[PDB]
Amino acid sequence: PEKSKLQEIYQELTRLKAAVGEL
Amino acid sequence: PEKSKLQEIYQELTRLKAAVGEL
Amino acid sequence: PEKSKLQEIYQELTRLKAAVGEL
Amino acid sequence: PEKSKLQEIYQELTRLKAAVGEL
Amino acid sequence: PEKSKLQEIYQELTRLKAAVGEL
Amino acid sequence: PEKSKLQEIYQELTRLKAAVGEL
Amino acid sequence: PEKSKLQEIYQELTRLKAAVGEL
Amino acid sequence: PEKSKLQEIYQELTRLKAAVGEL
Amino acid sequence: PEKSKLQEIYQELTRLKAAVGEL
Amino acid sequence: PEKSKLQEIYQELTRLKAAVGEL
Amino acid sequence: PEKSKLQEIYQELTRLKAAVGEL
Amino acid sequence: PEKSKLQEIYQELTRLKAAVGEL
Amino acid sequence: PEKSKLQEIYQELTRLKAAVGEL
Amino acid sequence: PEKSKLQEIYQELTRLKAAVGEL
Amino acid sequence: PEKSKLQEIYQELTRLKAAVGEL
Amino acid sequence: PEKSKLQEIYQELTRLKAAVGEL
Amino acid sequence: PEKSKLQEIYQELTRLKAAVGEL
Amino acid sequence: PEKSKLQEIYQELTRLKAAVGEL
Amino acid sequence: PEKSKLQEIYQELTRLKAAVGEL
Amino acid sequence: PEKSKLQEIYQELTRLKAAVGEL
Amino acid sequence: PEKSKLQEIYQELTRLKAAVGEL
Amino acid sequence: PEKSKLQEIYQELTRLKAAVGEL
Amino acid sequence: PEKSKLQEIYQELTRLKAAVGEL
Amino acid sequence: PEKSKLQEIYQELTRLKAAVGEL
């Protein structure tokens, strides 16, 4: 597992948090 | 921790993003 | 990072998916 | 990948779970 | 927002429809 | 809460508007 | 969609029910 | 369910309240 | 306005029709 | 109260007007 | 249509009944 | 039932009151 | 004006007709 | 009181006028 | 037609009856 | 029954009173 | 003038006719 | 009193006038 | 014809009866 | 019976009174 | 003048005729 | 008294006049 | 003819009877 | 019987009285 993978996971979570905040 | 684990995590996030987009 | 950490992360995602399915 | 990264991921999930519980 | 809220809204509408039908 | 619920609510309102227009 | 929205919808319905009861 | 749906529901209620006030 | 009001109006008219028929 | 009620009231008035015109 | 309208109609009928009783 | 209906009813009553006053 | 009044008028006329027939 | 009553009264008066004219 | 009219008619008849009784 | 009828009746009575006064 | 008056007049004439017939 | 009575009176007077003219 | 006329006629007859009784 | 009849009767009596006064 | 007077006159004439017949 | 009586009286006088003329 | 005439006639006859009784 | 008859009778008596006065 590489650093760039966890970043991409973290970045998805961020975009999921923002979507819920628009519900 | 192996690569296939983070993929499965990433893949779940994807299916969570899609579900919220149908709310 | 240890295996048990990614499992706990995966398990949280699971419980988040189920909550959204009850919205 | 370091321990502090998975913690930050876990912590985001936590704050996402709480937001959905307020929907 | 939870399921029980939309039900209570739907149930009010129902009782409003019935009242108008008695006018 | 799912999309089909708000539709059913919207559809009831529609039939309530039409009933009042016949008073 | 937030909780305060469905409340405002519910509250309008309430004031509509009361108006019809004065017809 | 999206924000624009509850608005459209709220807006219908408004036009229903106004119609009853003309009875 | 309620159903019982229009009935009472209709019933008065009836008793007015009968009175004129005795003139 | 329904449309057909006010019509029946209006129709009675009509027949009362005609009776008085024969006095 | 409002309550005060049917009252005013009912009140006119009353004064019409009384006039006929003086014929 | 609409406002214009009760007005037309009220207006007929008026013309009935005037006719009786000419008897 | 009531029925019994015109009868009393008619009845007087009758008794006037009979008186003239005795002149 | 009906039209036919006043006619019968008027008709009696007529026959009373004619009788006096033969005195 | 008003009550006072039939009275005046009745009163004339009375004075006609009395005149014939003096013939 | 109309006003003009009772007048015509009253007017006949008048002409009957005058005829008797010439007997 | 009453019937009994003209009879009394007629009866006097009769007794006058008889008196002249004895002249 | 009827016309035929005064005629019979007048006719008697006539026959009385004629009798005196033969004295 | 009035009462005072027949009296005056009756009174003349009386004075005619008395004159014949002096022949 | 009319006024002119009793006058003609009265006038005959007058001419009968005058004839007797010439006997 | 009465019948018995002319008889008494006639009777005197008779007794005058008889007296002359004795001259 | 009748005409034929005075004639019979006149006729007696005539026959009395003639008797005296023969004395 | 009046009473005083027949008396004067009767009185003449009387004076004629007395004259013949002196022949 | 008329005045002129008794005069003619009276006048005859007069001429009878005068004739006797010449006997």
Numbering used by the authors:
A (entry chain A), B (entry chain A), C (entry chain A), D (entry chain A), E (entry chain A), F (entry chain A), ...: 1 to 23
Quote from the publication:
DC-SIGN (dendritic-cell-specific intercellular adhesion molecule 1-grabbing nonintegrin; CD209) and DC-SIGNR (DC-SIGN-related receptor, also known as L-SIGN and variously designated CD209L and CD299) are glycan-binding receptors of the immune system. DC-SIGN is expressed on dendritic cells and some types of macrophages, while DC-SIGNR is expressed on sinusoidal endothelial cells and in the placenta. Although each of these receptors binds mannose and related monosaccharides, they have differing specificities for oligosaccharides and for surfaces of microorganisms. Both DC-SIGN and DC-SIGNR bind high mannose oligosaccharides found on viral envelope glycoproteins and can participate in viral infection either directly by facilitating viral entry into a target cell or indirectly by presenting viruses to target cells. The CRDs in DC-SIGN and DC-SIGNR tetramers are projected at the ends of extended neck regions formed from a series of conserved but not identical sequences of 23 amino acids.
